[PDB]
Design a protein around this ligand. Structure first.
Ligand SMILES: [Mg+2]
Ligand SMILES: [Mg+2]
Ligand SMILES: [Mg+2]
Ligand SMILES: [Mg+2]
Ligand SMILES: [Mg+2]
Ligand SMILES: [Mg+2]
Ligand SMILES: [Mg+2]
Ligand SMILES: [Mg+2]
Ligand SMILES: [Mg+2]
Ligand SMILES: [Mg+2]
Ligand SMILES: [Mg+2]
Ligand SMILES: [Mg+2]
Ligand SMILES: [Mg+2]
Ligand SMILES: [Mg+2]
Ligand SMILES: [Mg+2]
Ligand SMILES: [Mg+2]
Ligand SMILES: [Mg+2]
Ligand SMILES: [Mg+2]
Ligand SMILES: [Mg+2]
Ligand SMILES: [Mg+2]
Ligand SMILES: [Mg+2]
Ligand SMILES: [Mg+2]
Ligand SMILES: [Mg+2]
Ligand SMILES: [Mg+2]
Ligand SMILES: [Mg+2]
Ligand SMILES: [Mg+2]
Ligand SMILES: [Mg+2]
Ligand SMILES: [Mg+2]
Ligand SMILES: [Mg+2]
Ligand SMILES: [Mg+2]
Ligand SMILES: [Mg+2]
Ligand SMILES: [Mg+2]
Ligand SMILES: [Mg+2]
Ligand SMILES: [Mg+2]
Ligand SMILES: [Mg+2]
Ligand SMILES: [Mg+2]
Ligand SMILES: [Mg+2]
Ligand SMILES: [Mg+2]
Ligand SMILES: [Mg+2]
Ligand SMILES: [Mg+2]
Ligand SMILES: [Mg+2]
Ligand SMILES: [Mg+2]
Ligand SMILES: [Mg+2]
Ligand SMILES: [Mg+2]
Ligand SMILES: [Mg+2]
Ligand SMILES: [Mg+2]
Ligand SMILES: [Mg+2]
Ligand SMILES: [Mg+2]
Ligand SMILES: [Mg+2]
Ligand SMILES: [Mg+2]
Ligand SMILES: [Mg+2]
Ligand SMILES: [Mg+2]
Ligand SMILES: [Mg+2]
Ligand SMILES: [Mg+2]
Ligand SMILES: [Mg+2]
Ligand SMILES: [Mg+2]
Ligand SMILES: [Mg+2]
Ligand SMILES: [Mg+2]
Ligand SMILES: [Mg+2]
Ligand SMILES: [Mg+2]
Ligand SMILES: [Mg+2]
Ligand SMILES: [Mg+2]
Ligand SMILES: [Mg+2]
Ligand SMILES: [Mg+2]
Ligand SMILES: [Mg+2]
Ligand SMILES: [Mg+2]
Ligand SMILES: [Mg+2]
Ligand SMILES: [Mg+2]
Ligand SMILES: [Mg+2]
Ligand SMILES: [Mg+2]
Ligand SMILES: [Mg+2]
Lengths: 56, 114, 209, 118
RNA sequence: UAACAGGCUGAUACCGCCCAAGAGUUCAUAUCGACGGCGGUGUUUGGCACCUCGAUGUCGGCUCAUCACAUCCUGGGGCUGAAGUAGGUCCCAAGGGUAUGGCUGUUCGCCAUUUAAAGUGGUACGCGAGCUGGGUUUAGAACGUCGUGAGACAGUUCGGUCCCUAUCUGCCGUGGGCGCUGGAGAACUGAGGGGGGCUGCUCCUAGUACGAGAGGACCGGAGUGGACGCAUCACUGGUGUUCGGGUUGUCAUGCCAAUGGCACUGCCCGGUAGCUAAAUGCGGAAGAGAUAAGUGCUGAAAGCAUCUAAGCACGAAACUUGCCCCGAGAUGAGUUCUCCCUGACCCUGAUCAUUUUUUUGAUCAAGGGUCCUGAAGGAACGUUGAAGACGACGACGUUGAUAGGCCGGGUGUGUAAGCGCAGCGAUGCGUUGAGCUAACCGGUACUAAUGAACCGUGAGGCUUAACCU
RNA sequence: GACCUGCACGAAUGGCGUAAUGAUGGCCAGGCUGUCUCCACCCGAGACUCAGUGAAAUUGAACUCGCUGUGAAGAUGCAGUG
RNA sequence: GAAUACCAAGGCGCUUGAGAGAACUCGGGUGAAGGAACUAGGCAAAAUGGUGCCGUAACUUCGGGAGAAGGCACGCUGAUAU
RNA sequence: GUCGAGUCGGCCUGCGCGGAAGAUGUAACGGGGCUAA
RNA sequence: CCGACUAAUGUUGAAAAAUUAGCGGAUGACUUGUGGCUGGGGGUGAAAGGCCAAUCAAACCGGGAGAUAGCUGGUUCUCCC
RNA sequence: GAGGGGAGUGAAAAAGAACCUGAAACCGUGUACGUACAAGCAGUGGGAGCACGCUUAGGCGUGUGACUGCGUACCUUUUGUA
């Protein structure tokens, strides 16, 4: 099964109208290290909710 | 749930004797033939027991008048008037379905001396 | 006649003296609190809206809380409406309990049926399977034809095909009332009713009678 | 439908899952902290925590049950000699899962799983 | 320019009607209808060659249908050569229903045995980008037959590759957007749409009515079934590679003992939750309205007669409701309850109060941008669910039982390991219904559900009318 | 298995038999079964979601509905209408 | 047994992964009652399956047919026999 | 024998009536509607 | 080891003929390595018009060659009669 | 690193080696207008509104195009083709 007519650039765009990515609404700030992180994830420096969970 | 366990507890028989698969039991059941209600005995080996509270059941197998018959009794049903163990059998499985393929000497169950 | 909102506790059995086992659904019907009375002048129809159960306070929004407070009634877990018959009158804040069914022989029970997700035509519509063997190529549970030819040149509306099954309102009609237990807030009806254990049920006197 | 069912298939067969989680419980006991995918860490709780509960009661039979699972006598010894005593007064929840972003190779959600008193 | 299907046609076919010889004891018209006549359908056999030969796959089966009514059953009715029972024939009626097998590629047909009945047609003789491929219709081979022969035969015989990941329409489901005129959380109304609609047998009425008897009802009531449908898992069961056990071969954990891996889950026996049918609850209706054929009342035209012209009453599974489900994108965007927001402004305009057509202050806006503000609620994130492809929907986030774990229980398996005793030993016995036990039940903050942040605003157009001042 | 009415068998383009043999053609029975009545559940690989890579046939142009009719005679595109 | 199962020496996990646990397809496991009713046709599936011994019909070219068919035993320990 | 104004059944003709059943959907005025439109 | 009877899959394949479960021969008219010979109206064929380099009722390459094509397609700016 | 921004050379680097000119298909970013109750060769005739701009201050120019009449591509071949 294959198209009988070439779909337009218009139809292509209409289809892609749902493809836009969603940005993270807000980053969280660690209460101790003050660095930004994904909510409920640890920070880049190994902090979670003020606690130095992971070292090195 | 506590509600349903209460509803079932109020209905359970308090006089059920202990028995095990392989035991020979006699079950007395009410039979109504007209306005006449009488007790009929069904005696055989217990081949299965379902322990499920009010919904507990057990299956009794017998050879009767040349034919093998199984009856799955609902333990707490008022149709069952009394249960009595006639013989303690010694088996190792919970379910004795293999006896369906045995007759006579090959169907014998060793007595449980205890 | 109005009905009551309950909860599907589960099923069990009642053994009678003559050796019948009655399969029963146990329905917990706590007191139904009238939260609003609707009348012809203000609403165009006669009905009561009720609530039952309870909801955690921080889960009740200010609009819903104001609605409950106007009735002077503690917040329940939802709101359901029952249409009023001619001789039927109720007051806001009035409590209605399961003794409402004391003399009712049969009830209609409405619940949300269990959800089967995306169902095939075999399960959803009792379509027969094609051959398991005898050369069948990849077409064992598939629907078969879905129409005709050039006439009509389309599939008809309402064609039975695969899709969502269950997770919908269902009513089972004229179930025997086995027992009304006012002290324990319980209604036992003979037989199965829609929905999973713990889900809401709407119980009304049988419409067919 | 999967109503009321428990356990993740994790796109594996049962024997593979069993071996994988034997290995991973061994690793968590050995190192006390490991990084894995989030779903695997959540599944791993259900394997490792009963091992610690078993290790709370030191007996020959319990050590043999721990060995049948784990198949590692170093792991069994650590269980009974250190972790059971460490967790003797803790009613469950001997592990903690810490979400830590996404894997570079495959964007897999990742987490650390660690012993709570590590 | 043929074979398929469409198209045109309708001789032929099928159906209906007109005349009425005659059959029917009598009696054309209960039923049938000679010789002839008139139509309907598109429906058979055909006619034609208009479409397609830069391809419109052609029998039968399977799956899935949908419509017509010339009705097979069930429903209503007139006539009967209708006593009853059961029939005949015609009229109305399309709601629902409407065999399984043996033979054969069959369709068909015949046969067996069912059923209330086993309807007749249209839909590319419905349906091969849905299945099949037995038949027709390639290449092999053979028979009969024809031919000197190559070969040939709607004669037969054995064998003989069925592709397509769906763009559009359509259809089943499910979200996202905006709208509905301030924003928000809920409960609704019901325009409109869909589903459903089948029926047997037994008993009573009653061995009554009818009838010489044999037989044997209407009307009405009761129960219990077949098929179908919806829900559910209490029961009976299936499954149950996540629970327990038995066992073969082998390899390992040093070895014994005990275990693990592999062999289809190695092979098996059981089996929890869930899912489920064969399991068990429930349904089709009653009632109402308007009617069909049909039956009438009163009643003239037409002094009679007449169901009809005026008027009035009955009358069926068809129609409209009643029952179930969807349903306000019903843009005609509806209703009800509740909740929230009561800043400085500038730019500039609109009006006014001041002027000297220009001007000097006040009030207010469907302009605009900044400042302060950020509610109700929402979303997001996290723990999740008998909810789910993803979205969606539901529960919960420390003021917490949402999930995992943990504790107690239940369930299942069936008396663990270790030790002891008996036995030469395999093994048996005791400790012991032991040990282990998933998705179950009751509990429990041990672990993970973080303070925040984000979105959403700041009283909501014009006119007219009814009022309050 | 017979009968003979051989449309149109027949004797080395052999006739009639024939043990054994055949992935050969036909028919019947026991066993066996999800072939079927009539499907249910389960274990795996896809299908579905996320990240990376990344095809194809086809394609006059498309703002690419139903119905009844019309019409190169079987219409999304004509008429009317929903 | 150079079959097969598990291993040694040795060599490998096959150059996308991560989730989820719908329909439907593929490859498999099990199934109440029935048991070829399926279908062109038992297609597919299910089943049989080893060794020793007992026993084995018509027919026959005297070799066969024949593994016809059908049936019994089978593990482990001890003794006979350290 | 009874009532007091017409009665009867042939012909020719204008307009209508029955005869008149089909398949996706009203679907045999292009539609709405029309007793004249 | 040599085959290829049945089915399912695959059919823009993992593959221009395979994979999987089954299947036949398996001391012989067997099977295999290396090399050799037969050449296109010619070869070779336990015979299917089979095979002769994914090509066979007359191989492939080059040439006659722009064969011929009463057939199909296509044939390009403008205006006036 | 790739790649780029400067600096510098040069008449020119928008001649930077992926290098003279640098068309079209095709793909983007920005601005104006239209577009979420609306049915079909997408234009044509009519036509409001909006935005920008114009030497007479007046309408006009450019872009868009609500709503509305009409309207089934092109070639080829044909008796005749949406
Ligand atoms: Mg085309
Ligand atoms: Mg997309
Ligand atoms: Mg569900
Ligand atoms: Mg079937
Ligand atoms: Mg195929
Ligand atoms: Mg298949
Ligand atoms: Mg759960
Ligand atoms: Mg994967
Ligand atoms: Mg294995
Ligand atoms: Mg024709
Ligand atoms: Mg014809
Ligand atoms: Mg002609
Ligand atoms: Mg045609
Ligand atoms: Mg073509
Ligand atoms: Mg009729
Ligand atoms: Mg109808
Ligand atoms: Mg009706
Ligand atoms: Mg038949
Ligand atoms: Mg037969
Ligand atoms: Mg056809
Ligand atoms: Mg048909
Ligand atoms: Mg196909
Ligand atoms: Mg087709
Ligand atoms: Mg031939
Ligand atoms: Mg309907
Ligand atoms: Mg249960
Ligand atoms: Mg069971
Ligand atoms: Mg099992
Ligand atoms: Mg096991
Ligand atoms: Mg050992
Ligand atoms: Mg190994
Ligand atoms: Mg191995
Ligand atoms: Mg009169
Ligand atoms: Mg426990
Ligand atoms: Mg054990
Ligand atoms: Mg001959
Ligand atoms: Mg001769
Ligand atoms: Mg011969
Ligand atoms: Mg991707
Ligand atoms: Mg459109
Ligand atoms: Mg159409
Ligand atoms: Mg048409
Ligand atoms: Mg091998
Ligand atoms: Mg699966
Ligand atoms: Mg399958
Ligand atoms: Mg099997
Ligand atoms: Mg079975
Ligand atoms: Mg069975
Ligand atoms: Mg049998
Ligand atoms: Mg048959
Ligand atoms: Mg059949
Ligand atoms: Mg076979
Ligand atoms: Mg097999
Ligand atoms: Mg019609
Ligand atoms: Mg060969
Ligand atoms: Mg093979
Ligand atoms: Mg052989
Ligand atoms: Mg051999
Ligand atoms: Mg030939
Ligand atoms: Mg070749
Ligand atoms: Mg030649
Ligand atoms: Mg020449
Ligand atoms: Mg030439
Ligand atoms: Mg550089
Ligand atoms: Mg130059
Ligand atoms: Mg250039
Ligand atoms: Mg609009
Ligand atoms: Mg509208
Ligand atoms: Mg037009
Ligand atoms: Mg022509
Ligand atoms: Mg034309």
């Amino acid at each position: 099964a294959v198209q009988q007519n070439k779909p337009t650039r218009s139809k292509r765009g209409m289809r892609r109208s749902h493809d836009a990515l969603t940005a993270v609404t807000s980053l969280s700030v660690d209460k101790t290290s003050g660095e930004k992180h994904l909510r409920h994830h640890i920070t880049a420096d190994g902090y979670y909710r003020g606690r130095k969970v992971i070292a090195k | 749930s506590n509600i349903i366990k209460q509803l079932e507890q109020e209905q359970m028989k308090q006089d059920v004797p202990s028995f095990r698969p392989g035991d020979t039991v006699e079950v007395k059941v009410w039979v109504v033939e007209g306005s006449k209600k009488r007790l009929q005995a069904f005696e055989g080996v217990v081949i299965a027991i379902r322990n499920r509270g009010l919904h507990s059941a057990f299956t009794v197998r017998k050879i009767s008048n040349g034919e093998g018959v199984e009856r799955v009794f609902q333990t707490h049903s008022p149709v069952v008037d009394s249960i009595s163990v006639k013989r303690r059998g010694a088996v190792r499985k919970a379910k004795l379905y293999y006896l369906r393929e045995r007759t006579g000497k090959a169907a014998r169950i060793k007595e449980r001396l205890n | 006649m109005i009905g009551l909102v309950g909860k599907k506790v589960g099923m069990t059995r009642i053994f009678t003296e003559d050796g019948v086992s009655i399969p029963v659904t146990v329905i917990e019907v706590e007191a139904n609190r009238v939260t609003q009375v609707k009348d012809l002048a203000n609403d165009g129809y006669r009905a009561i809206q009720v609530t039952t159960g309870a909801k955690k306070a921080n889960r009740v929004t200010k609009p819903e809380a104001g609605h409950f407070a106007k009735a002077g009634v503690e917040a329940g877990r939802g709101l359901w409406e029952f249409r009023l018959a001619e001789g039927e009158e109720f007051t806001v804040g009035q409590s209605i309990s399961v003794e409402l069914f004391a003399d009712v022989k049969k009830v209609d029970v409405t619940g949300t049926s269990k959800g089967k997700g995306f169902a095939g035509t075999v399960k959803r519509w009792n379509f027969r399977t094609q051959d398991a063997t005898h050369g069948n190529s990849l077409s064992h549970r598939v629907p078969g034809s879905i129409g005709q030819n050039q006439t009509p040149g389309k599939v008809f509306k309402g064609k039975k095909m695969a899709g969502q099954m269950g997770n919908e309102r269902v009513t089972v009609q004229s179930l025997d009332v086995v027992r009304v237990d006012a002290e324990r807030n319980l209604l036992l009806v003979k037989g199965a009713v829609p929905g999973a254990t713990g889900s809401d049920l709407i119980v009304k006197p049988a419409v067919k009678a | 439908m999967r109503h009321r069912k428990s356990g993740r298939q994790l796109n594996r067969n049962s024997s593979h899952r069993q071996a994988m989680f034997r290995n991973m419980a061994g690793s968590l006991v050995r190192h006390e902290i490991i990084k894995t995918t989030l779903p695997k860490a959540k599944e791993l709780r259900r394997v490792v925590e009963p091992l610690i509960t078993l290790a709370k009661t030191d007996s020959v039979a319990n050590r043999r049950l721990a060995f049948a699972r784990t198949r590692d006598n170093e792991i069994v010894a650590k269980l009974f000699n250190e972790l059971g005593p460490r967790f003797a007064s803790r009613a469950g929840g001997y592990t903690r899962i810490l979400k830590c972003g996404f894997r570079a190779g495959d964007n897999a959600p990742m987490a650390y799983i660690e012993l709570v008193d590590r």
